[PDB]
Amino acid sequence: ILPDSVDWREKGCVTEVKYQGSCGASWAFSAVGALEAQLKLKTGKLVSLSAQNLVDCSTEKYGNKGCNGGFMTTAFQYIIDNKGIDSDASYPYKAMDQKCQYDSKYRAATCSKYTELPYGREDVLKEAVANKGPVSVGVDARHPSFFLYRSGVYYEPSCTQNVNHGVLVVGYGDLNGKEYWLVKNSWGHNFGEEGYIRMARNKGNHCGIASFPSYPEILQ
């Protein structure tokens, strides 16, 4: 019933790969990346949203700690509560904790709601990627093989289901006998496959990719 593969980048719903640097803001990149796709779907415009806005403004009230880590779910809740998030162009990324400088004059998106998917359910994750759009997830990236990944379907025997790095599932497929998740990272274009990593799919929640999925929506 579900398509064999989906790629939301091919549907024009994914912005350029970003570079987080030495600031632990992968949660903020994962969240804006999911919302960017919903924004494209609803308005026809593809616009990078401000991860720095989340770093500086979605802070202790949201359980988040800026460059020391955060949640995608509470990032979405900030955008709901704030009734907007600035464009990345107006509020660019500095890889530092800064004062909140959100300005509604440069609001580029809103968020109406978000959804959390059940733990470890790669079938439900697949359905959501097919039927909803890119999904924010955490993965276990504390392995040299992850940092050193260049191409192919990533499979790390010592991976755990305990996540520590936010990323964005923008698709999935089946290539060269291997089912995979298509994952947008925030380590710049020189990481992996032009900034992407394809991660083993249907291998018992490999690297925790389906541990904590969430996605936002923008309602009419």
Ligand SMILES: CCCn1nc(-c2ccc(C(F)(F)F)c(SCCN3CCCCC3)c2)c2c1CCN(C(=O)CC1CCN(CC3CCCCC3)CC1)C2
């Ligand atoms: C043991 C596992 C714990 N765990 N770990 C994650 C999780 C998910 C994704 C990543 C990613 F790598 F992608 F970044 C990470 S990396 C660690 C992030 N970590 C760093 C230190 C500062 C707090 C951030 C962790 C999640 C959960 C539980 C459910 N999850 C949620 O999002 C839902 C919860 C969000 C937090 N509320 C609590 C309150 C929220 C507002 C008021 C203050 C607390 C409860 C529901 C996802």
